[PDB]
Amino acid sequence: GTFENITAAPADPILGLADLFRADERPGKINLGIGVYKDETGKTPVLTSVKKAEQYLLENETTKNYLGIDGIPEFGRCTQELLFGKGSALINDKRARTAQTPGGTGALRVAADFLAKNTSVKRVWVSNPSWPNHKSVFNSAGLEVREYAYYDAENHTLDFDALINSLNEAQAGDVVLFHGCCHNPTGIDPTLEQWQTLAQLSVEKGWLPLFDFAYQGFARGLEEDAEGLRAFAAMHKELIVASSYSKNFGLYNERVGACTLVAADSETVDRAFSQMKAAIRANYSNPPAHGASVVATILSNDALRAIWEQELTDMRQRIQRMRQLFVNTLQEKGANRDFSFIIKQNGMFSFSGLTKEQVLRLREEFGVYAVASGRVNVAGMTPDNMAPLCEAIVAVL
Amino acid sequence: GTFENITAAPADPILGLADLFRADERPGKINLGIGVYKDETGKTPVLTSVKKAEQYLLENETTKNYLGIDGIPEFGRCTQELLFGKGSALINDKRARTAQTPGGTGALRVAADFLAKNTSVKRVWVSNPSWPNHKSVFNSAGLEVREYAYYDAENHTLDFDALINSLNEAQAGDVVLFHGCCHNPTGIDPTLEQWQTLAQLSVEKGWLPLFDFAYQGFARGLEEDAEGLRAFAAMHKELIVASSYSKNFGLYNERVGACTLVAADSETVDRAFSQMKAAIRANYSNPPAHGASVVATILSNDALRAIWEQELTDMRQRIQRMRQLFVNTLQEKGANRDFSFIIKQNGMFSFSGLTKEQVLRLREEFGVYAVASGRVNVAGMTPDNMAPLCEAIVAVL
Ligand SMILES: Cc1ncc(COP(=O)(O)O)c(C=O)c1O
Ligand SMILES: *Cc1c(COP(=O)(O)O)cnc(C)c1O
């Protein structure tokens, strides 16, 4: 019996939490786990720009014929402009190649498979803490995962001294993974000056930087959120960018991502990109069209794009209002601590500082669901559920 | 530099051709390469049942929130009914779990990863010839791929005696891959009693059967094409099925597939399926929704399903008509080689029996593109291009 001795797998710390929430019978449940945006009414809607783009596709698609291994060309072009800028030298020098992938996760696995099978890379450095699935993706491709310091739990800030010291151990040729913006789970991003320090330190020690870009547009703005990346881009000969449209387009279940490869010249990137296309062929062959077609349609049409940029702005601003409302309401419900640091965190998540035992008690006794690390989804908070949520947090302090 | 030591990847034997075809500048070219269906006008249209389902989705979809790791539940249920039968014992005993995957390739890759990490499987046996990407998928997981004999190139028949003898060294615990129907590229499938012999020999030797089902409904019918699988399923404790809807629904670029796990009992398959979900999570996280929603919508709605089943019949019967017309026109155009074996082969592909040198001559001398193995896509033949391409073949014989 080939399957008789298999060991059951542990639950996913994010998705395993969601199945529990769906099963909970109590009517006043609150879900602050998975990073999914909710509007004021508590729903995760389809954007108007997306619905209009889908209508265009429905009435104009003539075939479902396979896309190329790397996907829709216009999709790749628009992705590189978003990442690097309209008139970037990487683009004009033809130094960058982009493959449409199934989500940001798929972009990470493609890069990992590509590295482990075509290079001498054997080590990937990931911030501590980070998105839980990072370790799983790179380990599954056969790469070793090392951790570098990032979060100061006492000051609720970025420990730039610990980060630099920890990364001194990263040898040349290693891969160092950076969150482009809206660090998951801490919400604390480097300042532009800190980015430039890392970019200079990156070229000196010979690192291959890998950028995970899942939240472009949720910190300050589309262009503003890519400053750190464009600092590395202006200084490195090689780098990898895995990006996702799941969240800034609300296209989660359509799996829309990109893996962008940068090399010193056009000849080397095409040679390396051919091996990336080979790793894709042996995985899922070619990428799903519907989600990437929507994104390409929106970014290619100035009218649709104007709607989307405005829908994304409302998302960013609503999350900022909830951060404020969250802090004020905690003080009002009797919280003794100071939660002001939540105002300075970017993106959808906040490191609340709650212990594992408190997170566990919030779930069992109050029906409030957060990840065991104390990460809470601010974008899951509404004017309606704010008061019960804060009453439960104060009760477990 | 980390990318400068990378060696360029060779051209895909199937996709490297279609790129060389889109470049060709001659009028009247004919492409008998990629395995995509075409109607009598030479186009690959969206099925009417698919447009109807897509219209229903555009109007009723309220969210794009993530699917579960294994995808749409109803999609997995309908898949098992298609494979095993409406009232199979496998389903009632709850011995089967199905994961929605990005295409048939995605299902094969998920199985390869699952087997590599969680079992002592070290070897997959694949027919010679086979779909070229089989070796790449299983190799990507580190699995050794051995080949067994299949095609009698003299009689254009299944060499069943050589098949048996060549699998003598397949050990217990080895994986043996079978094409469920419409064998790619030969179009030669085992008979029902040949299937029965293989099922009986597979259980005595202890093989783990893995069925690749990309063409259900293109040989004889939906139920008849699954008889081989169901003969195995009635005798084996364990088996794997990778199925694809890319071709029988015309959803190529939406990447709609399924990996189905079968074990001895419900507790074992659940335990093993949890590890399969872990391998999906570390690859693309969760599957794309649009294509699978279309399939689930059609198969759950009796009105849409009757339309689709008729569109599939239309596709199947056109291919069989081109097989007849191809043989007849070859005679009309003066061929002395007997091509009657074309009529006996199932699906979209057949080995024409032309040498690599003749294939090269057809391509650069008449504008007719076929794979260098001599495989031709019969679904690429139309009443308008039949006479030109037959004139071309006769010329190089
Ligand atoms: C930092 C980070 N990387 C990658 C992902 C995965 O993106 P996707 O769901 O598009 O695969 C996420 C969360 O979804 C994330 O927060
Ligand atoms: C075409 C084909 C596949 C690929 O299926 P997709 O859904 O396109 O990924 C897999 N196996 C065989 C035998 C095929 O012919």
Residue numbers in the entry:
A (entry chain B), B (entry chain A): 0 to 396
Can I see the authors' text?
E. coli aspartate aminotransferase (AAT) is a pyridoxal phosphate (PLP)-dependent enzyme that catalyses the reversible transamination of l-aspartate with α-ketoglutarate, yielding oxaloacetate and l-glutamate. During its catalytic cycle, AAT undergoes hinge movement to switch between an open conformation, in the ligand-free form, and a closed conformation upon association with substrates or inhibitors. Steady-state kinetics reveal kcat/KM increases of up to 100-fold towards this aromatic amino acid, resulting in a selectivity switch of up to 1900-fold, and structural analyses by room-temperature X-ray crystallography and multitemperature nuclear magnetic resonance (NMR) spectroscopy confirm that the conformational landscape is remodeled to favor the target state.
To determine if these differences in the temperature dependence of exchange could be observed in the crystal state, we also solved the maleate-free structures of WT, HEX, and VFIT at 303 K, and calculated isomorphous difference density maps by subtracting electron density at 278 K. By contrast, similar comparisons for WT and HEX showed relatively little difference density. Upon soaking crystals of the WT enzyme to remove the bound inhibitor, we observed that one subunit (chain A) within the enzyme homodimer was in the open conformation, confirming that the soaking procedure was able to remove the bound maleate, and that the crystal lattice could accommodate the domain rotation required for opening and closing of this subunit. The 19F spectrum of WT at 278 K showed a single peak centered at approximately ‒60 ppm that shifts downfield as temperature is increased, similar to what is observed for free 4-trifluoromethyl-l-phenylalanine in solution.
